[model samples]
Target: AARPAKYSYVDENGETKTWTGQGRTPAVIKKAMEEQGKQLEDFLIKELE
Candidate 1:
């Protein structure tokens, strides 16, 4: 079976990462939200239907 296409976000320096709302939170995201006072929604890509 094929794996699902996970969600991703790109940071200001052009670095990218992905997640599926599971497992331990990534270091980049945690640092942004916990240390830098950034919002998760700020990095999320908006999709249209």
Candidate 2:
């Protein structure tokens, strides 16, 4: 099996956030962030919207 990979996203302010674990899938990362108290709305506004 292949090792898990890391991924990152840059916020509106250009701050880079990264995660590495079982999977780097969007949903996985999103859930991790939410568990860490980072809201989805904040992520949308910062990275998507």
Candidate 3:
């Protein structure tokens, strides 16, 4: 974890993530939110990282 992080988050189930948001939402962001029936709005980050 050296680079900068534009977005970061962690979903339930002991999962973590982090997103840059430079482009489209990463798959990790999708699955993470899908668990909550949400978009990247709820979880966006390397939390999925």
Candidate 4:
């Protein structure tokens, strides 16, 4: 299934500064971390399913 489009912010230096979403799978989480430079440890948690 196609995942919903989520929003996130990145700095000029290619750093993921912030994000807002519920619990995401490892794939999505990894994508976010890679694109936004967000640390998996610092991401906020919210129940989606």
The prediction achieving the highest lDDT against the true structure is 1
Give the Cα error of residue 35 in candidate 4, in Å. 0.6
Count of backbone clashes, every candidate in sequence: 0, 0, 15, 1
Worst 10 residues of 1 by lDDT: 40-49
Instruction: Please provide, for model 4 over 1-49, each residue's C-alpha lDDT reduced to its tens digit, 9 standing for 90 to 100.
Output: 7543344444466535444455655554677678867765554443334
lDDT for model 4, on a 0 to 1 scale?
0.52
Expressed as tens digits, the lDDT of each residue in 1-49 for candidate 3 is 3866756665576646566777777776766667757765455344544
- Top candidate (TM-score): 1
Higher-scoring candidate on lDDT, 2 or 3: 3
Candidate 2 backbone overlaps, count: 0
Candidate 3 lDDT (Cα, 0 to 1): 0.62
